[PDB]
């Protein structure tokens with residue numbers, strides 16, 4: 001007859017229960033701006049190279 | 054005082070006072086350094102390693118080999134080796150003895166000049182000499198004439214020596230030593 005607390009809480013719950021949306025939103029969006037450095041791990045690489053040849 | 058001799062015939066390196074029957078101990082002249090990020094923070098980082106210490110430690114170390122073809126490749130590395138050998142094995146100070154040096158014959162002056170320069174300056178040492186292998190080989194073998202073949206770690210030799218004299222024209226010198234053979238082995 002209505003739109004109610006009962007239904008709104010249903011929607012709320014389902015929202016809370018839906019893992020796919022929130023996890024995808026955080027992980028996939030945050031996955032893209034991942035990386036910028038002249039790695040010191042690569043500093044190791046360079047140093048080794050210096051020692052290499 | 055007393056008199057001390059370094060062997061720098063390549064391979065493990067031999068050092069001992071006059072009149073001992075055999076050198077106190079002997080070291081490969083490997084030199085080696087780290088290969089990987091040092092990730093035990095507890096560890097002290099030492100950046101260069103030599104001798105049986107390295108021979109144990111080898112795996113993450115990687116080797117440099119400071120003598121090619123009997124020619125000593127990189128001086129400061131040698132200096133590291135040399136310093137270590139004195140202090141760690143020998144417990145000896147450069148003043149303490151004359152010191153005697155052991156040379157491939159017929160090879161570039163530079164080894165002479167820098168070796169002496171360093172060891173008189175960097176070490177300060179009463180008396181210095183550099184001597185050609187075959188002479189020692191005769192003295193030990195005790196026949197005043199001869200011809201010697203000794204193909205060590207390093208460059209491989211023919212010298213006839215007659216009693217009391219050199220025939221430097223006679224002499225043949227070859228880079229065929231066992232290391233390169235071994236690399237053929239693979």
Ligand SMILES: Nc1ncnc2c1ncn2[C@@H]1O[C@H](COP(=O)(O)OP(=O)(O)O)[C@@H](O)[C@H]1O
Pocket residue numbers: 061062063064065203204205206207208230231232
């Ligand atoms: N048990 C062994 N059998 C055969 N060859 C060896 C043995 N131990 C060491 N060698 C080889 O002998 C050499 C040791 O160096 P060395 O003969 O002192 O050279 P150098 O004449 O430059 O001093 C190296 O070529 C080493 O591989």
